[PDB]
From a paper:
The [name] [name] regulator is essential to the viability of this bacterium and is responsible for regulating the expression of a number of oxidative stress defense enzymes. Importantly, it also modulates the expression of the CmeABC multidrug efflux system, the most predominant and clinically important system in [name] that mediates resistance to multiple antimicrobials.
Next, 8 mg/mL of purified full-length [name] was mixed with 2.6 mg/mL of 21 bp double-stranded DNA1, which contains two half-sites, S1 and S2, for dimeric [name] binding, and crystallization trials were again conducted. The best crystal of the [name]-DNA1 complex diffracted X-rays to 2.90 Å. Each unit cell of the [name]-DNA1 crystal contains two [name] protomers and one DNA duplex. One of the [name] protomers is bound at S1 of one DNA chain. The other [name] protomer in the unit cell is associated with S2 of the DNA chain. The [name] protomer, designated CosR1, bound by the S1 site, has an elongated and extended conformation. However, the other [name] protomer that contacts the S2 site, designated CosR2, has a more compact conformation.
Numbering used by the authors:
A (entry chain B): 1 to 220
B (entry chain A): 1 to 222
The structure:
DNA sequence: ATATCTTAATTTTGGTTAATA
DNA sequence: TATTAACCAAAATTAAGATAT
């Protein structure tokens, strides 16, 4: 999952990115609405962390622009003014969460994880398939599967986004630090790794390929 | 601190106790050497203050006994005989100190504090794991683990920077000398011995490696 | 034709094992 | 012992051809 930060204050923007990266997220920062708006046009972000109090934005337009271009991107607003009405304006403007500044980073990461779970649970438990992304483990029928690294991350991403196709660019954007540089075959070798150690041996078809579209996780 | 008072005079013994509790010492009292030894068997007292003059009058036989049964305990002897011989013959009997009566409870309290001061320890202790850097002793749940040499110092530096991560270079500059003339693999072979000796038989990750970051001590278990 | 799938080589990054200063 | 050399395992990544659409 890729997070984007738009903090006008220089020090805060940094601290946030460092904490987020430590957790396990891919990250890009912005200090401007214009600079932000460019990023959201080149890359896909799973969540955007923006300040309502920016010099070059009203907040409400910021939240509106992003949720129009990237309609599946989540918007979390941060404000030093956590007033009742400031919050309501943000949420009404299309924000998905509102947090007060100064920040509790332990609570932020929890909400970020909840927002990227897509309504799911932390441990993804479909049938006898159990993917614990936190301990990096996949178990089917009590039997353990051995998938690790990027290849495991596209599987959880494909599972968080089940019954939906995910373009190779989004998998790149979500999991690789510099998605533009890596060749898009990294994604295909990963899917082969997954299928080889899951779909092929366990007589199943978890991932489906859709030409000029992407891949789609299924468990029918 | 637990101090034991063996005094024949009840007057004083109550006074000795009252001042000693006022300072925050656990304190038990007696008037019989027999009684004293009993407490010793059941509990460990950091110090025992006792009168040189008692009905028993065993003298050294008291100091030598207390030390024999419980050697980590100190013996301070109280007497109203101030003669040099009394003092000397008592200290030569094993007394760690000789105070005089009439008693100056102010001095008395200061001297007990000095006989009980522990000082500074470099020992690191976590759960069942204790790391004694001065004795080169790593014991887990009473089970000495055989880590020695640079591996030991590497483990120490990490523990001292627990949670935090230490670069291979930091470890090199600290534990090793002239880091410009050592193969960095020395750290890998060090972490291996560390894991091979402790992390493994202890069945709990001791050290964790972080990509391009190095290692950080991680003991969040038994 | 393109699109991707597989398999292989290569690179990176520590971990392991002995031997030998 | 402490230091090294050789060796292993793993991920990453890119390449190439194969195979499917």
């Amino acid at each position: 999952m890729r997070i984007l930060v738009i903090e006008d204050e220089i020090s805060l923007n940094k601290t946030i990115i460092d904490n987020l990266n430590e957790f396990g997220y891919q990250t890009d920062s912005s200090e401007n609405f214009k600079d932000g708006e460019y990023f959201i046009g080149i890359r896909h972000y799973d969540l955007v962390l923006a300040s309502w109090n920016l010099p070059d934005g009203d907040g409400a337009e910021l939240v509106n622009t992003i949720k129009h271009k990237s309609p599946r991107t989540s918007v979390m607003i941060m404000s030093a003014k956590a007033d009742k009405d400031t919050e309501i304006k943000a949420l009404k403007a299309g924000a998905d969460d509102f947090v007060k500044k100064p920040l509790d980073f332990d609570i932020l990461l929890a909400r970020i994880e909840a927002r990227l779970r897509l309504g799911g649970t932390n441990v993804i438990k479909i049938e006898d398939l159990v993917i614990d992304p936190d301990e990096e483990k996949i178990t089917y029928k009590g039997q353990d599967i051995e998938l690790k690294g990027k290849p495991f991350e596209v599987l959880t991403h494909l599972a968080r986004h089940s019954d939906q196709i995910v373009s190779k660019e989004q998998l790149l954007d979500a999991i690789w630090e510099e998605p533009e540089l890596v060749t898009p075959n990294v994604i295909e070798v990963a899917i082969n790794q997954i299928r080889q150690k899951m779909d092929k041996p366990l007589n199943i078809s978890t991932i489906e390929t859709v030409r000029r579209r992407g891949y789609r996780f299924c468990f029918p």
